[PDB]
Structures are given as structure tokens and as C-alpha cells.
Amino acid sequence: HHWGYGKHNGPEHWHKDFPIAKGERQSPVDIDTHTAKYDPSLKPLSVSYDQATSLRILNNGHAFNVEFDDSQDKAVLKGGPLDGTYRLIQFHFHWGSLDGQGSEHTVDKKKYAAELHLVHWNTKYGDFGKAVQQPDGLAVLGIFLKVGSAKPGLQKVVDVLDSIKTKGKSADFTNFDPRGLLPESLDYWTYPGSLTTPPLLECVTWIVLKEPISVSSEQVLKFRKLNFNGEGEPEELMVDNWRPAQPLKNRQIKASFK
Ligand SMILES: [Zn+2]
């Protein structure tokens, strides 16, 4: 037995192995745009991805992860609600079985077809494993995906998924530029939260972009051909790998824009 997204091991079960699932600053949440508070003391995001060095793409049994070299300040996030410098370590997606679901965050109860998470860790803690133990240890940039026109910058990712169909498989994935995954605007909401997968640690500063990117029906369809299972095991399609919205509790969502 292990946690997953099935009927018998899904989000509603996670609290048994990971009690923090019922904690005070769990993610994702519903962003209520009318009760979000505009904060003019919030700065612009500074995204510096021009020296980013992608290494590998991996099917870890619940998503696929594109990994980056985080040994130096190559791809960093600064500004916004953050204090200090956050290094990009990986990005991954959450998606659905149908176009009308897939995102983790929702906006006035609207679900998007998928959600992209660019995960960064605060360099003052020296390594990722130390960072996740701290309340200001990670920053995650969340980007919604809607189905419309194709996203050209996503296609290199889509074309390599056949080679990592099953859990545990990995492929070399160098020279991918994550700047091709960003929307035009960097307007955002931000709130303190958690990882949305076990161990669900409450160490994340969420930065959710307002503007979705559009991908084609064909591109998201390829996501849905991946497998939760390992090679030689019964085929389980990797779909609906999203956690539903959690209670906001004593938190406020702030907006960088009016
Ligand atoms: Zn995620």
C-alpha cells in the first residue's frame, strides 16, 4: 500500500499516514477573487531563467518532473512576496481525465485543465531537504493551463513522454528553456501554503499567476497516456493527479494587481 490518487489511496485517505493533511496552511485553495486583498507593497516578480540548465525528465509514479541543475544560482526567482533568492529545482504538472478538471488551485471555483508548478527553494537553507523543514523554504510558481491553441514551448516536453511512459523511467532532457512556458503577464495572487503531495509540508509561499497559458487538445491528450504503474504491471493511466481545494482557515490571499 502507498498513497496515490485512486479510490482507495487518494487525497481523502492521506491524513492517516500524514496527519498534517488536516493542518492550518494546506494547499491547494480556492482563490475567491472578490475577497482577495490588493497589496500595493508587493513587488514585481523577478524571474531569471536565461542560464537555466535542465538535466532530466522523470516519471515518479504520480507526475513527471523536469529537473534542473540547482547547484548554483542559474535559474532563480526573486521579488514578489519573497525575501531572498530561490533556485529552480524542478517543474511538474497536474492534469485531468477531462478538459474541465485538472488544476489544483481554482479561481472562483473554476477548474482549469491542468496546472504547472515551478518549484524553487530558498538558498539560505543550503539544500532542498533543509528548505522543506522551514516555513519560508519553498516558493512555487503556479500557472494554469486552458485548452485552446498549442503552446510551442511545451512541445519538446510532450514529444519525450513516450520514452517515460511508466513509473521509474527517466530520460536525458537538456537545453530546455522554461521561459517558453510563461504567460505574457506576471500578475499574481500569493498566500502561505504547503506541498500538495505527501509529505504535505507547510513550507511553501504560493505565487499563482492570473493569466493562464493555452495548450492544444492534442498536447494535453499526450499527458493522459502516461502510466501511474511501473513497466510490466497492469496499466493505470496517469490522470486526475490533483488534490482538491483545502480550507483557507486563518489565511488571506493577496493580489499583486487590481
Ligand atoms: Zn504540484
In whole angstroms, what separates CA 202 from the centre of its chain?
15
The experimental technique used to determine this model is neutron
Distance 198 CA to ligand 1 centre (A): 11
Structure-block grid coordinates of residue 131:
528548505
Work out the number of other CB atoms within 10 angstroms of the CB of residue 162: 11
What is the span of the domain harbouring residue 254?
A: 1-258
Catalytic amino acids?
Answer: 62
Tell the residue number behind the cell numbers 528553456, with chain if given: 177
**Does 190 carry a binding-site annotation?**
no
Whether 74 and 178 have beta carbons less than 8 Å apart is answered as no
Distance 231 CA to ligand 1 centre (A): 24
Question: What does residue 158 show for φ and ψ, rounded to 5 degrees?
Answer: -65, -40
Could you give the count of Cα atoms lying within 13 Å of 191 in the half-sphere of its Cβ?
A: 31
Question: In the chain, how many domains are there?
Answer: 1
**Does 1 carry a binding-site annotation?**
no
In whole angstroms, what separates CA 75 from the centre of its chain?
16
- The DSSP-derived string for the chain is ----SSTTTSGGGGGGT-GGGGSSS-S--EE-TTT-EE-TTPPPEEEE-TT--EEEEEE-SSSEEEEE--SSSSSEEEETT--S-EEEEEEEEEE-SSTT---SSEETTBPPSEEEEEEEEEGGGSSHHHHTTSTTSEEEEEEEEEESS--GGGHHHHHTGGGG-STT-EEE--S--GGGG--S---EEEEEE--SSTT--S-EEEEEESS-EEE-HHHHHHHTT-BSSPTTS---B-----PPP----S---EES--
**Does 34 carry a binding-site annotation?**
no
Distances (CA, A) of 60 to 101, 173, 177: 22, 15, 22
Whether 216 and 149 have beta carbons less than 8 Å apart is answered as yes
Tell me the Ramachandran region of residue 200: left when phi exceeds 0, alpha when psi lies from -120 to 50, beta otherwise.
left
Strand-pair category, 76-79 with 86-95: antiparallel
Distance 223 CA to ligand 1 centre (A): 15
Distances (CA, A) of 38 to 12, 34, 43, 91, 206: 33, 10, 12, 28, 16
Distance 196 CA to ligand 1 centre (A): 6
Distance 64 CA to ligand 1 centre (A): 10
Distances (CA, A) of 20 to 25, 135, 209, 256: 9, 14, 26, 29
Distance 142 CA to ligand 1 centre (A): 8
CATH number of the domain that residue 227 is part of: 3.10.200.10
Whether 120 and 90 have beta carbons less than 8 Å apart is answered as no
Distances (CA, A) of 169 to 4, 52, 66, 140, 229: 18, 23, 12, 25, 11
